[PDB]
Amino acid sequence: WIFKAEEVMLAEEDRNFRRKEKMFRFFIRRMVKAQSFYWVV
Amino acid sequence: IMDNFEYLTRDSSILGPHHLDEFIRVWAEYDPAACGRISYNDMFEMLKHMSPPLGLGKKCPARVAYKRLVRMNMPISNEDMTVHFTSTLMALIRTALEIKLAPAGTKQHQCDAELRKEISVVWANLPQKTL
């Protein structure tokens, strides 16, 4: 739940460097936990 | 193994399947034959000679035994020349575990009805032993 809110308050904080590399991390974490990645591995 | 799991997890302090064997052994020596009914004064010495694991541990619990012989319904209503094993061992096994009559003191009929409905098909052999 907390992570969901962190990725919800980060899209509304950029919508209006060291920040651009963090939506990439969020997308990666959303990608390493999906069923597609699990089945592929 | 699972057919005998009740015996294999005994924790032998409230055992009932084995003390009945000792009860039968004690009764056989004092009894030459059934003959219907037996005397009264034998039961006191039988309780004294009964296995301490069930019936009396120390001198004080004997009072509890008296509390099981007195302060409730009496088999003295019929002839005093009557057996008591039908009413003594049953009472002791009822009071040793899952006692319910003492807290109430008046709901004996419900307990008797529960016993009857749980012995529904015994060909009416225990009805004469409940007394």
Partner: protein, 55 residues
Amino acid sequence: KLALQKAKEVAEVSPMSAANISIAARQQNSAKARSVWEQRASQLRLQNLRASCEA
């Protein structure tokens, strides 16, 4: 418990959550195998707890 509480908030209309939790409480009840080991363990737990409480 949550389904029973569901009906409590909705006091402006007759709630159907009780019926939904009733029809979904007995269908899965037939899965209680309760093997001999589990029954014996429950009885032993009851006896040990009674002995500990009564000392």
